[PDB]
Design a protein around this ligand. Sequence first.
Ligand SMILES: [Mn+2]
Ligand SMILES: [Mn+2]
Ligand SMILES: [Mn+2]
Ligand SMILES: [Mn+2]
Lengths: 745, 745
Amino acid sequence: VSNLTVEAFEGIGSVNPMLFYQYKVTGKGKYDNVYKIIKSARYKMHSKNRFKPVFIKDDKLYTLEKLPDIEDLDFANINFVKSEVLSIEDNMSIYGEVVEYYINLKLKKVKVLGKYPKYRINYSKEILSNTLLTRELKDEFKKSNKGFNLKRKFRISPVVNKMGKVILYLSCSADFSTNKNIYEMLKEGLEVEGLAVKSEWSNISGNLVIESVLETKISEPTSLGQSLIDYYKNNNQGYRVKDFTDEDLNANIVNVRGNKKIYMYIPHALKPIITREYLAKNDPEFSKEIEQLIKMNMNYRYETLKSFVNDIGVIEELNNLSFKNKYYEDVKLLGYSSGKIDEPVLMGAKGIIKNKMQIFSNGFYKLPEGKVRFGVLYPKEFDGVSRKAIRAIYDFSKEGKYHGESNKYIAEHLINVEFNPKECIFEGYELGDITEYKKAALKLNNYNNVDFVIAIVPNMSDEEIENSYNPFKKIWAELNLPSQMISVKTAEIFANSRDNTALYYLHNIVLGILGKIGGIPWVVKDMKGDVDCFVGLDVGTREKGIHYPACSVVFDKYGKLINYYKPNIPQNGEKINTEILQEIFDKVLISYEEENGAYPKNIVIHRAGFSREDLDWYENYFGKKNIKFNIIEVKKSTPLKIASINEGNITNPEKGSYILRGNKAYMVTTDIKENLGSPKPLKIEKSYGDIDMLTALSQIYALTQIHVGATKSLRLPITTGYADKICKAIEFIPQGRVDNRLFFL
Amino acid sequence: VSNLTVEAFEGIGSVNPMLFYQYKVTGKGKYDNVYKIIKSARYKMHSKNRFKPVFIKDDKLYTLEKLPDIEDLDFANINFVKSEVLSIEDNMSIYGEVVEYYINLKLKKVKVLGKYPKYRINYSKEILSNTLLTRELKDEFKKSNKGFNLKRKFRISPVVNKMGKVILYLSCSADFSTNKNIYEMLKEGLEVEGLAVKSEWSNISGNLVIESVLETKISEPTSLGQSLIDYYKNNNQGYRVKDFTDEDLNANIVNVRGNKKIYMYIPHALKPIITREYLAKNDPEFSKEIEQLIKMNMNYRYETLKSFVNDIGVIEELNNLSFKNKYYEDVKLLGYSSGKIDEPVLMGAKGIIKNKMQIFSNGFYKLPEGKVRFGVLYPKEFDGVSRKAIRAIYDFSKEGKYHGESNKYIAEHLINVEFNPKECIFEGYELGDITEYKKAALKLNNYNNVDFVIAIVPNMSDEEIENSYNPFKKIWAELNLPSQMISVKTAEIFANSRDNTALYYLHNIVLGILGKIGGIPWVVKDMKGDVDCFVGLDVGTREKGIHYPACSVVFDKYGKLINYYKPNIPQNGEKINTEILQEIFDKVLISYEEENGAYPKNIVIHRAGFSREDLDWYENYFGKKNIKFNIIEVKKSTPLKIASINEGNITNPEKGSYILRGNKAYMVTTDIKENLGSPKPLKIEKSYGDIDMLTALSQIYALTQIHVGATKSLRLPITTGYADKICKAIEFIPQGRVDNRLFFL
DNA sequence: TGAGGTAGTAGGTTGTA
DNA sequence: ATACAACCTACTACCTCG
DNA sequence: TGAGGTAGTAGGTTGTA
DNA sequence: ATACAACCTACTACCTCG
Ligand SMILES: [Mn+2]
Ligand SMILES: [Mn+2]
Ligand SMILES: [Mn+2]
Ligand SMILES: [Mn+2]
């Protein structure tokens, strides 16, 4: 079969134990906690010792050769203690830091083209490479002609076993930067009005946007009583303004909004942020050029990390440590266990389907009851476009028709739609002011001949005249009428296109219309393992000090939604309080009792991220009710990527392919072919449970393959995925009594 | 008439300009901002100069005699600059700080009983007095026999005019403290299990509760590797443990929960917090003894501040400055303007009412439509008590009956209640687990013969077997059935009492039942001034990092509710974002358009607290729609209190009595007689508007006198008051479509 | 949580820079 | 890191309401 | 916002103490 | 005051779907 591996390189040769020099930090300042200063003390005494290696075990610093203990620092009185030879088996992290330091020190000495420093080292886990390995396996710089710079960003994280052998886990990424700040942009005469900027001179994390470009020079005395050059010389920062020429002093003051007040910052400091939007807006030839370099399949990631490890070479400071240039043949040698999960078979109307595409030729599993009356808002410029769009939607849904042609892929009467254009309402709304949009939606609900809305909003792009999605969905949220919004572009593709691209869009629209009115298109034949209900959980942070309420979806064992609950109070942080947990799981058990007459004997809780809560509360609440339960953390953001092997040819893994060790497991949920990127697998780990992980992974991969919003599978299981979508549609909840209508989809 | 005054004393004699010594602070540390350190530098160099006066103008410190500039401080390099004589007219705040410093320095020198320091000075605006002036005008200490200490807390805030005369604004308050920490409590053998505590040795603001009392001595080496006495000697705090005897070292370690981890703190540090609960639980004779001393009418506040000013006496450091012992005869001499607002006449069913009590003999203004069917949950122990309670409620509401006796204060058919005990449901619920309460409420709504619930919850006091109010109101919130909850105590008073106290309780219950089903009991005849709709606004902070959503009520000009809106997203801080403002005022204008066919030509916005928002957004939004608007900040917490004068006899003012200067005005909204406390007036100020303040105060006092939840007036206007109650009932909003049913009441 | 007011305790948010 | 000033909030007593 | 995946950028929360 | 580590979120490109 196709064995699996991760982005890891076995180190030939082992790390011998080294002579360490142990240091001591005490809280000399007005504080006394060494733990609030210990990493900063490491950084300061590391940089002040010509970047010689400085380590951290819990309070004891370590160096590899002799450094004088420093009393010059105001906050930390670092002192020598002893010299010793620490064993590996108690100090895994320290020897890992040793290996990644010596990798950083070998990669500073590596030059490309004989002239240029290849890797930008800051002696950390991150190694920026100034040049990239291309698809054609040639080290070439990628700079735009507008100075935009692409850099291949590496994160090393080596692991040393108890014996001393080294396993180097790599992860490669891209980076956007530029060598041109606002000073060279105004020297080029470019307009920076309204750009977001990142001031390179301060570590202040925040989003700064330019207000204007003042006519005042940076050397002239400003509104603060002094010039900005004098302002930086007063702040012990005259070194930044020391090398300024007269032409540098002719610079225009660029005032910048800084989330509390208009700052006045000089343009030699402010590098413009390189968003993907910014690359697309300013150099779209370069921006579309690098989609083969940013999005990487497993073969090109293996080639990039192969070039990286060949750049490392032998490390003579660790007993001639040299890494292999190949991945592992199998992760059983790494301690993982691998496999492919069987595909979850689905049910439609008249039986099993061999993919998600056959269901419009088969019919949906659970119809809703009763007629649904379309009633559509449309912008007044886009009349015939909207009419042809709803014509295509009604042809697909009710009449089984496509372009006026009956089609063998589609059965008649998919949804019992009562839409007659002679009797329906096509309310037209002026694009413009927001209260006109809200009055337009209330004007559509001023009639009783509508049960569903297919309102045409303008595009979510095109920042001009105001979008209608948010006011429409807020009003239809208050009125409890479900609605499937369509952008103008999709309406124009329904009107104008003659290909099956409109068939794809119409598939996803009709699945949305079905899911919003309570229908269920397809269900699982048999879920694997002993389970009665799946419960999702997620708490998302929208902005600073914001937390989305702990939205929890509840599924049955066949995967259809039972109940979702949003607590009306916002909670403190992404740990859930026990009051909110009690309310959520009371809704869980009462909803499953309402649909099936008993408490569920087995719960699998998928928590999106960290299950930070009291496990004792869960033990209490499901021990007083005799419920076995499982908490399986589904985690999205993971730098680990999974590969495949067929006679050594590294390629992207199939959907449903996984790796497993103990109580954590990574699983590829989506089939992405080459020239589109790598599969970004989930991190799935069990914080508490008594089920084996093969069952929990089969359950999660089954809850990925039953996303009822699209003909293609969701990466997330729809437990955490639908919790995430309720967190996105957090202001769009239907006001009236909570149903199984998947409004958020 | 009865003139008005505030708690202010005119200073006989004026402050001459003084010779100031000006200092300079620079950011010597790793920061450079003087503004983040300037007050701490003032405090440090004030305490290090034997508490000689140290002032703050924006960055320039001032002293009154010569102090050597200090370089010993690590963070601030304070330096002498110059000696000068500053004028008062540019330095109001500095001479105010001078006057309050010399008041602190005179009051340190004042002894009571010839022996004891009367006032506990920390050289600030707060002056704790160790003794109290009693009701009988005798300076007597108030200590419990359990060591609980009552202290009369004074806040001085003198104001100097441009000429130099001093006006001393006083405010007196009470204080709870004790001289007995956990060490003397365990020496007395008292149980401290579960108490909240305030550790006196750290400035860390947080709520600490005791877990247990360990058998480990504080001198024995603890779980941290060292003893706690060694832990405090390592933290430069051996002075706190220096004077410990052997008996002090026999102390038991009292571990304490500290919101992240169990701290281990020694009992000589932890003073127990003196809540009013704690005084009531431990010394209820003392706790009920001091309700004449804490709650102060205006006469006793005038006597207490008279004793305070007589304790100040002459100040020879300010040209023999001496204060008067009397208030002002009128606040026109202070620059305010006073008066009493006319009482807003009300409408019932058959005409005007002369108070709120006549409406049950008159009938309500707006009935609801259709029968309301009571259906009641009751705890199973309290069957006949609940039956007699609902009997009294149904007798009052439908039959006009009281104790089986028709009464001239009550007209028949107050609410069209269809409650027949032979046909209704009395569902009984077991006191206990919370999901049983939720299943009990869903079991009551399993029938369709109920439109309103009068469920009997257990008491909100009595921490034992779990309360039912929160699960009941959450379930009836989801199901959109309004419900008037009644505690067991009020049910027992309905069952057992024969007096008119049950008539009072039944008044407020029937007003609640009317308000929850959409009825409006009484409305204003004519609101004063040009106004079409009142809009409330409030954003409350529940806990750390929590913000209640920006709940906004909308009233008409007659005061009945139109619409309330809760944005489903929680916002960042108690400033409202412009997105949320646009959504709120779109609901405002569309709701008033739905009820009256046009946009309102005049809006008076009552914002609870600070109108921190973009005034430019309001100018934009109501200039593009041709709406004059007013933002009148209604502010609750105010230390200022208002008095009255009748031949010098100071007494509490009537409700609707106000003082006014410019764009801020204080107004007494409630008539509180003597022996019950002082009226706590609103602070009402106009951040933007074009109405005179007499009109806005008449509007606010009219919106206090039409609270439809009680027979006695609300202190707040019900704009900010009902916004506050929706913030309290933030998880109790009815799920279904938002109506004018005042659910929160 | 009959309703509301006074009164404490604790704890935040925001401005003022 | 810091700190008062106005403002808030919650929780518990007490007290009263023809 | 047809739907979803990859990919960047920025920015938080929480633990680990 | 501090800082990385795993985790998140939002917003914009690109790309593809019988
Ligand atoms: Mn999330
Ligand atoms: Mn959708
Ligand atoms: Mn509030
Ligand atoms: Mn109530």
